[PDB]
Design an enzyme around this catalytic site. Structure first.
Site, mmCIF file in Angstrom:
data_model
loop_
_atom_site.group_PDB
_atom_site.id
_atom_site.type_symbol
_atom_site.label_atom_id
_atom_site.label_comp_id
_atom_site.label_asym_id
_atom_site.label_seq_id
_atom_site.Cartn_x
_atom_site.Cartn_y
_atom_site.Cartn_z
ATOM 1 N N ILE A 1 44.981 66.964 6.978
ATOM 2 C CA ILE A 1 46.062 67.960 6.972
ATOM 3 C C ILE A 1 45.621 69.123 7.857
ATOM 4 O O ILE A 1 44.439 69.268 8.151
ATOM 5 C CB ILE A 1 46.344 68.496 5.555
ATOM 6 C CG1 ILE A 1 45.112 69.244 5.018
ATOM 7 C CG2 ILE A 1 46.716 67.347 4.658
ATOM 8 C CD1 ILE A 1 45.286 69.801 3.622
ATOM 9 N N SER B 1 42.846 50.813 20.778
ATOM 10 C CA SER B 1 42.541 49.600 21.515
ATOM 11 C C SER B 1 42.341 48.280 20.787
ATOM 12 O O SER B 1 42.379 47.232 21.427
ATOM 13 C CB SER B 1 41.306 49.861 22.388
ATOM 14 O OG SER B 1 40.160 50.141 21.586
ATOM 15 N N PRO C 1 37.068 47.625 33.965
ATOM 16 C CA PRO C 1 36.906 48.959 34.550
ATOM 17 C C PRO C 1 38.012 49.318 35.538
ATOM 18 O O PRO C 1 38.816 50.218 35.275
ATOM 19 C CB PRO C 1 35.538 48.870 35.213
ATOM 20 C CG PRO C 1 34.787 47.988 34.275
ATOM 21 C CD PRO C 1 35.790 46.889 33.976
ATOM 22 N N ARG D 1 29.022 49.476 23.824
ATOM 23 C CA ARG D 1 28.159 48.307 23.728
ATOM 24 C C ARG D 1 27.734 47.682 25.065
ATOM 25 O O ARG D 1 26.569 47.314 25.228
ATOM 26 C CB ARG D 1 28.821 47.266 22.829
ATOM 27 C CG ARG D 1 28.817 47.668 21.359
ATOM 28 C CD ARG D 1 29.744 46.798 20.524
ATOM 29 N NE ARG D 1 31.146 47.172 20.686
ATOM 30 C CZ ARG D 1 32.159 46.492 20.157
ATOM 31 N NH1 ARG D 1 31.917 45.398 19.439
ATOM 32 N NH2 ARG D 1 33.410 46.904 20.335
ATOM 33 N N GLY E 1 37.604 50.716 25.167
ATOM 34 C CA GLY E 1 37.989 49.322 25.046
ATOM 35 C C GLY E 1 37.618 48.535 26.291
ATOM 36 O O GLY E 1 38.114 47.426 26.503
ATOM 37 N N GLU F 1 45.068 72.400 7.468
ATOM 38 C CA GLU F 1 43.981 73.236 6.951
ATOM 39 C C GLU F 1 42.605 72.631 7.163
ATOM 40 O O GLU F 1 41.712 73.301 7.675
ATOM 41 C CB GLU F 1 44.177 73.517 5.456
ATOM 42 C CG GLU F 1 45.431 74.337 5.124
ATOM 43 C CD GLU F 1 46.741 73.673 5.586
ATOM 44 O OE1 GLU F 1 46.944 72.469 5.308
ATOM 45 O OE2 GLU F 1 47.572 74.374 6.222
ATOM 46 N N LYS G 1 38.183 61.637 15.754
ATOM 47 C CA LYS G 1 39.519 61.199 15.370
ATOM 48 C C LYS G 1 40.068 61.973 14.192
ATOM 49 O O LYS G 1 40.524 61.376 13.211
ATOM 50 C CB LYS G 1 39.486 59.735 14.997
ATOM 51 C CG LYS G 1 39.086 58.863 16.139
ATOM 52 C CD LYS G 1 38.934 57.475 15.675
ATOM 53 C CE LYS G 1 38.506 56.648 16.816
ATOM 54 N NZ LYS G 1 37.235 57.177 17.360
HETATM 55 O O1 LIG Z 1 47.057 63.366 2.450
HETATM 56 C C1 LIG Z 1 46.096 64.098 2.411
HETATM 57 C C2 LIG Z 1 44.783 63.655 3.025
HETATM 58 C C3 LIG Z 1 43.612 64.039 2.075
HETATM 59 N N1 LIG Z 1 43.805 65.441 1.566
HETATM 60 C C4 LIG Z 1 42.613 66.218 1.100
HETATM 61 O O2 LIG Z 1 42.787 66.635 -0.308
HETATM 62 C C5 LIG Z 1 42.168 68.023 -0.430
HETATM 63 C C6 LIG Z 1 43.219 69.044 -0.912
HETATM 64 O O3 LIG Z 1 42.584 70.304 -1.130
HETATM 65 P P1 LIG Z 1 43.684 71.304 -1.745
HETATM 66 O O4 LIG Z 1 43.864 70.948 -3.172
HETATM 67 O O5 LIG Z 1 43.108 72.825 -1.546
HETATM 68 O O6 LIG Z 1 44.975 71.139 -0.920
HETATM 69 C C7 LIG Z 1 41.661 68.377 0.980
HETATM 70 O O7 LIG Z 1 40.262 68.062 1.101
HETATM 71 C C8 LIG Z 1 42.475 67.519 1.882
HETATM 72 O O8 LIG Z 1 41.781 67.294 3.137
HETATM 73 C C9 LIG Z 1 45.092 66.001 1.456
HETATM 74 O O9 LIG Z 1 45.219 67.122 0.994
HETATM 75 N N2 LIG Z 1 46.194 65.317 1.837
HETATM 76 O O1 LIG Z 2 41.278 53.305 20.112
HETATM 77 C C1 LIG Z 2 40.092 53.410 19.938
HETATM 78 C C2 LIG Z 2 39.550 54.548 19.113
HETATM 79 C C3 LIG Z 2 38.272 55.110 19.791
HETATM 80 N N1 LIG Z 2 37.391 53.991 20.217
HETATM 81 C C4 LIG Z 2 35.918 54.245 20.403
HETATM 82 O O2 LIG Z 2 35.501 53.907 21.791
HETATM 83 C C5 LIG Z 2 34.119 53.305 21.690
HETATM 84 C C6 LIG Z 2 34.109 51.879 22.263
HETATM 85 O O3 LIG Z 2 32.766 51.374 22.261
HETATM 86 P P1 LIG Z 2 32.799 49.918 22.969
HETATM 87 O O4 LIG Z 2 32.908 50.142 24.442
HETATM 88 O O5 LIG Z 2 31.396 49.137 22.546
HETATM 89 O O6 LIG Z 2 34.007 49.144 22.387
HETATM 90 C C7 LIG Z 2 33.779 53.296 20.188
HETATM 91 O O7 LIG Z 2 32.999 54.448 19.847
HETATM 92 C C8 LIG Z 2 35.105 53.337 19.517
HETATM 93 O O8 LIG Z 2 34.987 53.887 18.192
HETATM 94 C C9 LIG Z 2 37.923 52.739 20.531
HETATM 95 O O9 LIG Z 2 37.174 51.841 20.892
HETATM 96 N N2 LIG Z 2 39.246 52.502 20.471
#
Ligand SMILES: O=C1CCN([C@@H]2O[C@H](COP(=O)(O)O)[C@@H](O)[C@H]2O)C(=O)N1
Ligand SMILES: O=C1CCN([C@@H]2O[C@H](COP(=O)(O)O)[C@@H](O)[C@H]2O)C(=O)N1
Lengths: 216, 221
Positions: free
Chosen positions: A67, A118, A180, A194, A172, A69, A63
């Site tokens: 940003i 979900s 299913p 699960r 879900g 980069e 997921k």
């Molecule tokens: O809103 C966000 C999410 C977290 N971050 C995190 O902050 C860090 C910024 O690094 P820089 O200072 O080089 O942009 C980087 O790890 C980035 O993933 C954001 O920059 N903006």
């Molecule tokens: O919308 C989402 C994000 C991804 N997932 C991912 O799908 C997987 C579902 O596992 P279950 O079938 O036990 O709920 C689990 O790894 C969960 O993180 C969601 O269930 N819903």
């Protein structure tokens, strides 16, 4: 191409427990979704060990939601580690998604876009943006999507937005309350966690899901 | 506030270099100027989660795992537990997935005696598409959930000002986007308790100099 349209959500955080349950259903599934619970606990190498052991396809359910980069570095490390595809959040915006898309293209791999989640909290903010996110995905050229099995009507709107030539997978099912068959009416494959790996016998549970789906 | 864990010099290092030796070397060079390091997935996915305990022991710094947890409640709890087990002091969680998703993180944080930082608004351009429209509400949700630590965008000082007035003076706010993303340390620090800085420091010819210079421009304010 997902065998039996069933993908296993291996979220056991134990390598032995995980490898074992993934072997008890390997004959039924050939596509495994691996997430942070297992990768963080056992390391990114658990992915190659899953491939070497079960010769299965790997979807990294990370997921990505940072940003551009950083999304690039996460995708690169994930593909380097051998994942076939990575699931990316769309709520961060188009530039964030286009970053994983570039790395997927550069390494010949795939990006799946998560449009709507979900779980219940998903209604507060995600649900109302779901359609615009699925649309953004279309503008970007995304061909792979992830949608909520818990909301069949939503899962249906998603499919009419992405088109029939798009690949859609849906989590879900089971534990969270999804069926299913009803899910498979709009999605190409279902993700089940699960319901299989927390079952006295995952081999059966899995089989049971396929037996109520062969009628599809 | 004072009822919160402060950060040395109001500067948090975002260590996103992807290989252990350079990460350890660059961090060691600036250790004199900061005591809080933000470790994200770029490093953790390349070198393993053990890297969190190593930085913690080696530098005596507090670690914030910038994992932006954004899954369902059940999975968020497993991610937070693994992160805290790895030794992190705090974890950054996304709010857009909803209240039940944030509460699952908060339960494990308070269970293990660790912290949660709620990411309300992001700092990249694309953040205007869907997150900015929900940010004020995400912040309001965090306050209601009991969240005391937040993350807001340096690239948009007016938006960071709104966040601060939503969360109040007692909440702890840290902000990224200073430097490579264009944010200024000064304006940002008018609302945020501390800034997060990555590239401006770890890609500089001389990291220590880069860090000392920032701390200086901050010194007067
Ligand atoms: O809103 C966000 C999410 C977290 N971050 C995190 O902050 C860090 C910024 O690094 P820089 O200072 O080089 O942009 C980087 O790890 C980035 O993933 C954001 O920059 N903006
Ligand atoms: O919308 C989402 C994000 C991804 N997932 C991912 O799908 C997987 C579902 O596992 P279950 O079938 O036990 O709920 C689990 O790894 C969960 O993180 C969601 O269930 N819903």
């Amino acid at each position: 191409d997902v065998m039996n349209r069933l993908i296993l959500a291996m979220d056991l955080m134990n390598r032995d427990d995980a490898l074992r349950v993934t072997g008890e259903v390997r004959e039924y599934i050939d596509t495994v979704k691996i997430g942070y619970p297992l990768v963080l606990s056992e390391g990114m190498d658990i992915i190659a060990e899953f491939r070497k052991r079960f010769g299965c396809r790997i979807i990294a359910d990370f997921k990505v939601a940072d940003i551009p980069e950083t999304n690039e570095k996460i995708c690169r490390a994930t593909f380097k580690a051998g994942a076939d595809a990575i699931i990316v959040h769309g709520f961060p915006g188009a530039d964030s998604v286009r970053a994983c898309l570039n790395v997927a293209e550069e390494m010949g791999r795939e990006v799946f876009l998560l449009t709507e989640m979900s779980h219940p909290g998903a209604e507060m903010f995600i649900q109302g943006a779901a359609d615009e996110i699925a649309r953004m995905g279309v503008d970007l050229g995304v061909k792979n999507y992830v949608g909520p099995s818990t909301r069949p009507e939503r899962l249906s709107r998603l499919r009419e937005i992405i088109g029939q030539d798009s690949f859609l997978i849906s989590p879900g099912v089971g534990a969270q309350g999804g069926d299913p068959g009803e899910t498979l009416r709009f999605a190409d494959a279902i993700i089940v966690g699960r319901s299989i790996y927390l079952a006295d016998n995952p081999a059966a549970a899995a089989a049971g899901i396929i037996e109520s789906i062969k009628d599809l």
